[PDB]
Design a protein around this ligand. Structure first.
Ligand SMILES: C[C@@H](c1cccc2c(-c3ccc(CS(C)(=O)=O)c(F)c3)c(C(=O)O)[nH]c12)N1C[C@@H](CCCN)OC1=O
Ligand SMILES: [Zn+2]
Ligand SMILES: [Zn+2]
Length: 232
C-alpha cells in the first residue's frame, strides 16, 4: 500500500513496480539462492512511447512476471534492456527478454563473464565503458563505469531528467550490515569506485541500490563505510 516493498512482502515469482519519479520505476522481485530468499531491484525508464529496462528480475519466471506487470501497470513495450553486471540477478531472464522482442545489452566485460560462468548472455556489447569514469548515453539514461566494486564489470545508471542514480549492486541500502555477496568483489577498489560515483553525480536526488530500499546520496557513503569495515 505505497511503501517500498520488502523481501518478506513479495513471494518468489511475483514482481512489483514502484514509482520513483515521472517516467522512472523500480522493479522488485525475490529469489532463492543457497537456501535463503533475497529481494532485488531493477529499473524501468520511459523512452517516449517505449521503455528501457535495467536488469532482469533474477530468473526466467520472475522476468516473465516482470514483463506482465509492466504491461498491466504501464502498458508500453519494453524494447531494450541493459544488464549492469554478469550475475544472475542482472542477466537471469535475458533469454526470456530476447524471446519477447527485447534487445539486450551489456558491456563486453559483462558478456564475457556471463558466458564464462554459464549465465545468460545479453546480445549486444556496449562499447565506450571499459575505463573507470567512462560514460555513454543510452536512450534516456547515462551509463557510467565507476571501476571495480561489487564486481569488476558493474555499471551504474543515471536518469538525468529525474536525477535518479541507480547504483546496482555497487551500492547498498542504508540498513546493510556487510557488503553483501562479495564473491566477485574488489573490496580495496570499491571505496574508490564509490568516490567516483559521488563525484560524477553530486545532484542525485534518489539513489537505488541493487537490493533493498532506495534513499538519498547517503547510500553512497554508507556503502563505502560498510565495504571498508567488511574488508577490515
Ligand atoms: C546472484 C548474486 C547474489 C545471490 C544471493 C545474495 C546476493 C546479494 C546480497 C546478499 C546480502 C545482502 C544483505 S547485506 C548488504 O546487508 O549483506 C544484499 F543486499 C545482497 C548480492 C549483492 O550483494 O549484490 N548478490 C547476491 N550473486 C551470486 C554470486 C555469484 C558469484 C559468481 N562468480 O555473487 C553474487 O552477487
Ligand atoms: Zn552481483
Ligand atoms: Zn546483486
Amino acid at each position: 500500500s505505497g511503501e517500498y516493498p520488502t523481501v518478506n512482502e513479495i513471494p518468489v515469482g511475483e514482481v512489483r513496480l514502484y514509482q520513483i519519479a515521472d517516467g522512472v520505476w523500480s522493479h522488485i522481485a525475490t529469489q532463492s539462492f543457497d537456501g535463503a530468499v533475497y529481494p532485488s531491484n531493477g529499473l524501468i525508464v520511459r523512452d517516449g512511447d517505449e521503455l528501457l529496462l535495467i536488469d532482469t528480475a533474477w530468473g526466467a519466471k520472475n522476468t516473465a512476471a516482470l514483463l506482465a506487470e509492466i504491461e498491466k501497470q504501464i502498458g508500453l513495450p519494453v524494447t531494450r534492456a541493459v544488464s549492469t553486471h554478469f550475475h544472475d540477478d542482472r542477466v537471469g531472464g535475458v533469454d526470456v527478454l530476447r524471446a519477447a522482442g527485447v534487445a539486450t545489452y551489456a558491456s563486453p566485460s559483462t558478456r564475457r563473464l556471463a558466458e564464462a560462468e554459464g549465465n545468460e548472455i545479453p546480445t549486444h556489447s556496449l562499447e565506450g565503458l571499459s575505463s573507470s569514469g567512462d560514460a555513454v548515453r543510452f536512450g534516456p539514461v547515462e551509463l557510467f563505469y565507476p571501476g571495480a566494486a561489487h564486481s569488476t564489470d558493474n555499471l551504474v545508471v543515471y536518469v538525468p531528467s529525474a536525477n535518479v542514480l541507480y547504483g546496482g549492486c555497487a551500492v547498498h541500502e542504508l540498513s546493510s550490515t556487510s557488503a553483501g555477496n562479495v564473491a566477485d568483489a574488489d573490496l580495496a577498489e570499491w571505496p574508490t569506485s564509490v568516490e567516483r560515483i559521488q563525484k560524477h553525480y553530486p545532484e542525485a536526488e534518489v539513489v537505488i541500490p541493487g537490493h533493498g530500499l532506495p534513499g538519498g546520496l547517503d547510500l553512497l557513503q554508507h556503502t563505502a563505510n560498510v565495504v571498508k569495515a567488511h574488508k577490515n
